[PDB]
Design a protein around this ligand. Structure first.
Ligand SMILES: NC(=O)C1=CN([C@@H]2O[C@H](COP(=O)(O)OP(=O)(O)OC[C@H]3O[C@@H](n4cnc5c(N)ncnc54)[C@H](OP(=O)(O)O)[C@@H]3O)[C@@H](O)[C@H]2O)C=CC1
Length: 317
């Protein structure tokens, strides 16, 4: 069998190569259905230049869901709709994706797949939350979340669904984005934080040069002996006020890529509280049906220009 892979051969420029696919291997052959563009995929799509020319031809997307078209080992029946887990250290823009049986998680019968496409973000978030030893955290704690974007929103959702009596505060920059947080107890601008505000556990869901600012602020405002979960990637160093981490006894925990246990947990949560899938739906930005190469460039440019939400891709190549 012949697989068409849609690789990036130069920024803002896609081209198609071929490779063979063995129907009868210990993999499960999956056709992607919906898939979402990651910040990480946009770094490559636009632009070190020696690290760029390193993996220079490669497939991009890594957040997606699909149907089982073959399973030679007989585990998943044909057509089973499944969420696709990538490798923790090739991509999904191809006609078929081969997965280990533990790298493919089955979905319920009826479920909006266009919004299940960005389940990797939900796993990243749940992974971070679970880094706080659940025995230490009741629905009597009080959480803070920096960043009014996709990770911010998912984390707010998760804390509210599973720590239901707890308090949640969200800190951001724009009225547009902060209005989406309604199930939160209160919402603040980083510009307009009242003296006297307090919380014991916090989540940094800001990246880039903004992570530095977010971190110093939560260090300053957090109750002493509080813990902080680091989620944002900085791809650079950032100045930290360590004096205060000492004086206050703060614990800072880094959380990154997730494992297939988090994908199974996130699915089992979709089963449990479908409120999540409905709240997650507010993140679905624009959807694109991808039938030619052009239909990709348009989608990537549009995800560049996008204010709020994730850009979904309906795969019909
Ligand atoms: N740990 C992991 O495995 C993964 C980590 N990530 C990372 O998480 C980071 C961001 O995630 P995401 O929400 O999706 O990206 P977003 O583009 O949605 O940015 C999040 C929000 O934070 C805002 N912001 C900017 N500065 C600050 C500040 N100083 N304090 C509070 N909020 C600020 C931004 O508003 P504005 O635009 O106005 O600046 C933005 O609205 C990235 O670095 C990304 O790479 C994503 C995938 C998985």
């Amino acid at each position: 069998m012949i697989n068409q892979v849609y690789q990036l051969v130069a920024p803002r420029q896609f081209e198609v190569t071929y490779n063979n696919v063995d129907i009868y291997s210990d993999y499960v052959i999956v056709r992607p259905l919906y898939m979402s563009i990651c910040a990480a995929d946009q770094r490559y799509y636009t632009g070190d230049e020696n690290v760029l020319s390193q993996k220079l031809p490669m497939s991009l997307i890594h957040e997606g869901v699909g149907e089982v078209v073959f399973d030679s080992k007989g585990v998943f029946n044909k057509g089973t709709k499944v969420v696709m887990v990538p490798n923790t250290p090739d991509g999904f823009m191809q006609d078929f994706v081969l997965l280990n049986h533990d790298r493919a998680v089955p979905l319920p019968d009826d479920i909006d797949l266009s919004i299940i496409s960005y389940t990797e973000l939900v796993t990243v978030s749940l992974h971070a939350i679970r880094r706080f030893e659940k025995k230490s955290i009741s629905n009597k704690n009080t959480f803070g979340i920096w960043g009014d974007g996709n990770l911010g929103y998912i984390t707010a959702i998760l804390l509210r669904k599973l720590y239901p009596e707890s308090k949640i505060y969200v800190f951001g920059k724009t009225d547009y984005k902060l209005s989406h947080f309604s199930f939160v107890d209160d919402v603040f601008f980083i510009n307009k934080i009242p003296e006297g505000l307090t919380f014991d556990h916090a989540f940094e869901c800001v990246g880039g040069r903004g992570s530095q600012s977010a971190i110093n602020q939560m260090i300053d405002y957090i109750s002493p002996e509080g813990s902080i979960a680091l989620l944002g990637v900085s791809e650079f160093p950032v100045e930290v006020n360590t004096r205060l981490v000492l004086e206050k006894g703060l614990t800072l925990i880094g959380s990154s890529r997730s494992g297939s246990k988090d994908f199974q947990d996130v699915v089992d949560l979709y089963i449990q509280y479908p409120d999540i899938v409905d709240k997650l739906a507010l993140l679905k930005g624009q959807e694109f049906e991808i039938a030619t190469i052009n239909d990709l460039t348009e989608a990537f440019e549009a995800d560049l220009s996008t204010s709020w939400g994730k850009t979904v891709l309906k795969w019909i190549m």
